[PDB]
């Protein structure tokens, strides 16, 4: 799974089966990292109009 | 892929199914790759 974003701590109580999370666009918004099983929230990097 | 979803619920109804809502969590995702068309459940006898 490829993508760009800022990985931050999260307070979303994922259930054991649950691995990732999806937004309306179906792009991944949270993910469970292998090896350490922690849940990292994925927030798209800041952008806007110059 | 043979998916087993399971849920355990504490109930107190005597005869029929209880009326309510309980979502079944996925338990086992099993990589078998075989054809399944017929099943049979297993019971346990009591001997005295
Ligand atoms: C699976 O088994 C059924 C009944 O034996 C048969 O009709 C069907 O063609 C089989 N499918 C495959 C992919 O073997």
Ligand 1, pocket-test mutation among B33, B35, B36, B39, most atoms within 8 A of CB: B35
> CA-CA distance, A35 to B18, in Å (whole number)?
41
Beta strands in chain B (DSSP E): 2-6, 25-30
> CA-CA distance, A35 to A18, in Å (whole number)?
16
> CA-CA distance, B27 to A45, in Å (whole number)?
35
């Amino acid at each position: 799974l490829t993508g760009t974003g800022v990985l931050t701590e999260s307070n979303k109580k994922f259930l054991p089966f649950q691995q990732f999370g999806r937004d309306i666009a179906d792009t991944t918004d949270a993910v469970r990292d292998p090896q350490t099983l922690e849940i990292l929230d994925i927030t798209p990097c800041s952008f806007g109009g110059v | 892929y043979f998916k087993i979803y399971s849920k355990h619920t504490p109930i107190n109804l005597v005869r029929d199914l209880p009326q309510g809502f309980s979502a079944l969590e996925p338990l086992v995702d099993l990589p078998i790759g075989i054809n399944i068309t017929r099943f049979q459940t297993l019971l346990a006898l009591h001997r005295s």
